[PDB]
Structure 1
Amino acid sequence: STVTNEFCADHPFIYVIRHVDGKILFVGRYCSPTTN
């Protein structure tokens, strides 16, 4: 199914910073918050 009206990232996700052409600059995983 999957959402497509709401993107609620309230659970682990992967994020990728990239150049529009397609070169990947950074890749990360968000598992939980840090500090406060």
Structure 2
Amino acid sequence: NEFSADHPFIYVIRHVDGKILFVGRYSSPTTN
């Protein structure tokens, strides 16, 4: 019962039950 995002993953921002506002992939930390 632990969700650890310490490796490549997909994330999606959205309206509760609406359209997808964004969608990306987290591959590297890219110290911005």
With the shorter chain as reference, the TM-score category is: 0.7 to 0.9
Gapped regions of structure 1 (runs ≥ 5): none
Q: Structure 1 stretches (4+) deviating beyond 4 angstroms?
A: none
Deviations 1:4-26 (A, max 9, x none): x0000000000000001221000
More relative contact order, 1 or 2 (CA 8 Å, 6+ apart):
2
1:35 Cα deviation from its structure 2 partner: 1.9
Instruction: Indicate the structure (1 or 2) with the bigger Cα radius of gyration.
Output: 1
TM-score by length of 2: 0.85
Report the number of matched residues. Answer: 32
- Give the share of equivalent positions with the same residue, in percent: 94
Counterpart of 1:27 in structure 2 is 23
